[PDB]
């Protein structure tokens, strides 16, 4: 500070200005990233690996910032995308415009604790009409059209075009078989994409898809107990050293000769352990194969952890490197163990399915994985909004159409309550139009055009916009009545989480 000491990241500009920078600075791309969008935002890794996300996190978790608040608020966006799903971009984009209001209240010079409460009581006042803005609920998981609609706004507010087809797919993923009564498998149903075919050819499979190549004669039974091992056959090459390296140079050679008898007795023990599918993260080899052909066990030639862990998870298995003949602590959890060729590619298909504990593994297909990876992002939007764990989700109009419902009132309620308080309440309800503006300016029309119409249409829950021509001029799309809705829960956490950080980050002078 004034002194040799005091290493400080915030205060003065930093507090006043520079926090609001990374607030609005990061809130930039989420303006494009929530609500109906195609927006191409090209993200590559430290691998510099091409990708585009319409969800903030892959932009967010990609990024690097010395601003802890901006580094924090994502955890609320996390807490969104953790508890919830699409609407994660909404988290950041809301607060940033709301936060500028406080700094302009600091351009007014308004006291922190005084601006603090104005967002909060108004939030619970927004949370007051938020259930009042519950219009419908999500009636039946068993109803595809309920879940498609559930998936629609989900995929839409990331990707508007692919919306309903996917929304019909993952609704007909029949994840409804998970009652959402307090059980739904999120990972056990996880997508396994197929590079190749179409993304319209992208479908849902039930039972665990494993795109990795079947080896050995396919499983002797189905319900075949599942030996999931990190390297049961990597070859007989040594697993045995603490650093997994050479001790003396003579050990690697013996692994060629007794390989047969090992890869006999080993997968013989796989036949002996009861596993008719042994999953080898290490390499498939002929002797294993040849003997797993004699023993008719399906080898799973090579494994991602995502393969292994899921098999470690879903099967209850433990993936372990093996040379000696192994045993099953693993067995199966799976009552049908398949090699199927899906996407035309050989696909290991494990299946056990229950109202609670099913695996319905969506098989995406498509010419590019840089398609399906962002598609999965757009798809996981609804996979999330599936899990609310109120089957009837108390849908409020999605797409921010029920904003102006709150927006008009809380800000009219704004002047109702008094003082430096009332401004932050008024400011609170002024941050609604941001997302529609952000969206309508993704379709390229200002709020005031759009929003004065949303002000003109008054109490609807219906009107909002942001990718369409009806987005442009009319300020009328149905983000309610057209099949776009959103659960109270997400919309709660949409308001709730966007409420929390914005206030809490306001304190820091360091």
């Amino acid at each position: 500070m004034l002194k040799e000491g005091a290493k400080h990241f915030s205060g003065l500009e930093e507090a006043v200005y520079r926090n609001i920078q990374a607030c609005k600075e990061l809130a930039q791309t989420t303006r494009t990233a929530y609500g109906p969008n195609g927006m191409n935002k090209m993200v590559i890794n430290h691998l510099e690996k091409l990708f585009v996300t319409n969800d903030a996190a892959t932009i967010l978790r990609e990024l690097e910032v010395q601003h802890p608040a901006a580094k924090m608020i994502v955890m609320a966006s996390h807490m969104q995308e953790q508890e919830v799903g699409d609407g994660t971009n909404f988290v950041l984009v809301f607060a940033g415009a709301l936060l500028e209001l406080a700094e302009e209240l600091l351009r007014i010079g308004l006291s922190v604790s005084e601006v603090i409460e104005g967002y909060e009581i108004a939030c619970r006042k927004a949370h007051e009409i938020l259930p009042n803005l519950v219009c419908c609920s999500a009636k039946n998981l068993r109803d595809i059209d309920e879940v498609s609609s559930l998936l629609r706004t989900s995929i839409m507010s990331k990707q508007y075009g692919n919306e309903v087809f996917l929304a019909k797919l993952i609704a007909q993923a029949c994840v409804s078989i998970f009652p959402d009564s307090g059980h739904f498998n999120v990972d056990n149903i996880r997508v396994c994409k197929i590079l190749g075919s179409g993304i319209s050819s992208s479908s849902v499979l039930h039972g665990m898809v494993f795109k990795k190549e079947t080896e050995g004669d396919v499983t002797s039974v189905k319900d075949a107990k599942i030996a999931v091992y990190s390297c049961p056959f990597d070859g007989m090459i040594t697993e045995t050293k603490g650093t997994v390296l050479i001790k003396t140079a003579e050990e690697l050679m013996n692994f060629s000769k007794g390989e047969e008898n090992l890869m006999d007795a080993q997968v013989k023990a796989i036949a002996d352990t009861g596993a008719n599918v042994v999953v080898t993260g290490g390499k498939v080899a002929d002797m294993a194969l040849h003997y797993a052909n004699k023993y008719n066990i399906m080898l799973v030639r090579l494994n991602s952890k995502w393969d292994l862990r899921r098999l470690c998870k879903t099967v209850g298995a433990t993936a372990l490197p093996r040379l000696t003949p192994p045993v099953l602590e693993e067995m199966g959890h799976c009552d049908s163990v398949y090699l199927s060729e899906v996407g035309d590619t050989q696909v290991v298909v494990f299946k056990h399915e229950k109202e609670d504990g099913a695996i319905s593994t969506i098989v995406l297909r498509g010419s590019t994985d840089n398609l399906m990876d962002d598609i999965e992002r757009a798809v996981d939007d609804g996979v999330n909004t599936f899990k609310v764990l109120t089957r009837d989700k108390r849908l409020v109009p999605g797409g921010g159409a029920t904003e102006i419902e709150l927006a008009k009132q809380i800000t009219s309620y704004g002047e109702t309550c008094p003082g430096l308080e009332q401004y932050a309440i008024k400011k609170f309800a002024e941050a609604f139009e941001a997302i529609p503006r952000a969206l309508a300016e993704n379709s390229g029309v200002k709020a005031n055009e759009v929003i004065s119409k949303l002000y003109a249409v008054h109490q609807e829950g219906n009107k909002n916009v942001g990718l369409d021509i009806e987005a442009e001029v009319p300020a009328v799309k149905d983000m309610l009545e057209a099949g776009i809705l959103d659960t109270y829960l997400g919309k709660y956490w949409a308001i709730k989480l966007a409420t929390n950080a914005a206030v809490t980050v306001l304190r820091v002078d360091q």
């Binding site: 002047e415 008094p418 003082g419 430096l420 200002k446 005031n448 004065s452 003109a456």
Partner: protein, 513 residues
């Protein structure tokens, strides 16, 4: 030539010069004031609550710094006051409106919000303006003494108003009391250098300082004969041209004395008859006028025919070409008081012309000739509010609560208007409320919570009538508090205010030629 000028840069400098000029002047405004002290490039300091006095005496610049004094002077002449309002009002509206609205990117809807805000402003004013008696100088006093205390001076609040109160009522027009239009040649003020406020009083009529300038002239002869030129003293004063010689150097001295020797005969035919008054609009030369002063014929000159015509009938007269030629007879005396006061060696002829258009040049004095001026500067604004109470008996209370009274009334029309125009019409609204806020932030504490209490007060209690106190900041009644913002003076500042900002809107571009 290849030149073009782009967009915001002028508009910024407009908004820049707009608000900056507004800053100190709006803090110089109000019961709690400030001072704008210039420091001349020479080292002389100039401290005035009026930046119009400061800016004209310092650098005046091509942007609205050029356009602020014009509309200030436009606000200077008409009513006589609001001088500090327009630049703090125009600097007020343009900033808050444009940028946000030019961030919404449009000139046009911004232009309309002015005329939008104009009527609601007219509306809630004319509504919540309070009619005050035209014929009661006391009911005039509380409204008229409020407009004196406005700028730098409460000193002449009682005195200037008192001198202003009855005079303006006692004025008339060509179209008729005074009332109606703004004519300030019926508001006239001529100084009495030195003197005292006790020697001063209300002169409801006109004085001619040049009527009697000497004890020799007609004095206190109360049936006047005022004479317009044409025979006794003719239109032509030209040379006699007797025995002129172009070949003589002595004739050069002769031709200049010969001008007045014919004028000598002109004022001599005044002597041959002696109509007790003589007026000449081209003025009389001295050598002839000495003879006028021998005949006790008051010599009126360097004050206009229209002036004298308005004074003659109002003091009474029969005009003739020459008294031996009577065109027709008029009334002998039109006034009740013919008074010549002497302060210094100068004689000041005060002819009270009662219920007369006249020139209404009103007797006023300070202790010295300088504070004598602050009688007039207040008298003007006093006579302004005198003519205003005559013009508009209805005039608002406010501490600037009118500037809220409109803004929320704007807002509640703005809420009713909606459209995109809602935002400009509201972006014009919140501008108005910084003016009284600066008055009551000069007071202190939270002037927002005040405006909260204000806009609470607005529809709750009242808008402008039950107001905010410029010396306090609490919610009060400016009528009860006796503070008054004159309706005309209010609206007039705004008519002048709205336009310059529209010009600054219109101008993204200038030239050097």
């Amino acid at each position: 030539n290849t030149k073009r000028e782009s967009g915001r840069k002028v508009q910024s400098g407009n908004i820049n010069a707009a608000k900056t000029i507004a800053d100190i002047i709006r803090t110089c405004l109000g019961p709690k004031s400030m001072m704008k002290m210039l420091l001349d490039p020479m080292g002389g300091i100039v401290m005035t609550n009026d930046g119009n006095a400061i800016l004209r005496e310092i650098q005046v610049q091509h942007p609205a710094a050029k356009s602020m004094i014009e509309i200030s002077r436009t606000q200077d002449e008409e009513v006589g006051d609001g001088t500090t309002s327009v630049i703090i009002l125009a600097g007020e509206m343009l900033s808050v409106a444009e940028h946000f609205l030019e961030q919404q990117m449009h000139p046009t809807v911004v232009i309309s919000a002015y005329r939008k805000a104009l009527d609601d402003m007219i509306s809630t004013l004319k509504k919540i303006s309070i009619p005050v008696d035209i014929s009661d100088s006391d009911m005039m006093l509380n409204i008229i003494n409020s407009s004196i205390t406005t700028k730098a001076i409460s000193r002449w609040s009682s005195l200037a108003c008192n001198i202003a109160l009855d005079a303006v009522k006692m004025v008339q027009f060509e179209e008729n009391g005074r009332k109606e239009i703004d004519i300030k040649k019926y508001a006239r003020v001529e100084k009495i250098p030195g003197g005292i406020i006790e020697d001063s009083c209300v002169l409801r009529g006109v004085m001619i300082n040049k009527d009697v300038t000497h004890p020799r002239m007609r004095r206190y002869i109360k049936n006047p004969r005022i004479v317009l030129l044409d025979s006794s003293l003719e239109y032509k004063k030209g040379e006699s041209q007797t025995d002129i010689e172009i070949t003589r150097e002595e004739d050069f001295t002769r031709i200049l004395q010969m001008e007045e020797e014919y004028i000598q005969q002109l004022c001599e035919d005044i002597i041959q008859l002696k109509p007790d008054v003589v007026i000449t609009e081209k003025g009389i030369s001295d050598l002839a006028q000495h003879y006028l002063m021998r005949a006790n014929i008051t010599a009126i000159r360097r004050v206009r025919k229209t002036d004298n015509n308005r004074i003659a009938r109002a003091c009474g007269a029969r005009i003739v070409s020459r008294p031996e030629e009577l065109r027709e007879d008029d009334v002998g005396t039109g006034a009740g008081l013919l008074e010549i006061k002497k302060i210094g060696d100068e004689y000041f002829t005060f002819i009270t012309d009662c219920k007369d258009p006249k020139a209404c040049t009103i007797l006023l004095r300070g202790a010295s000739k300088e504070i004598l001026s602050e009688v007039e500067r207040n008298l003007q604004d006093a006579m302004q509010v005198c003519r205003n109470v005559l013009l508009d008996p209805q005039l608002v209370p406010g501490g600037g609560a009118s500037e809220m009274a409109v803004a929320h009334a704007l807002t509640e029309k703005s809420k009713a208007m909606t459209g995109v125009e809602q935002w400009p019409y509201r972006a014009v609204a919140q501008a108005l409320e910084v003016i009284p806020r600066t008055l009551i932030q000069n007071c202190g504490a939270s002037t927002i919570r005040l405006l909260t209490s204000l806009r609470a007060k607005h529809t709750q209690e009242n808008c402008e009538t039950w107001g905010v106190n410029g010396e306090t900041g609490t919610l009060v009644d400016m009528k009860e508090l006796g503070i008054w913002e004159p309706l005309a003076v209010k609206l007039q500042t705004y008519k002048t205010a709205v336009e310059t900002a529209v010009l600054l809107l219109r101008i993204d571009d200038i030239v050097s030629g």
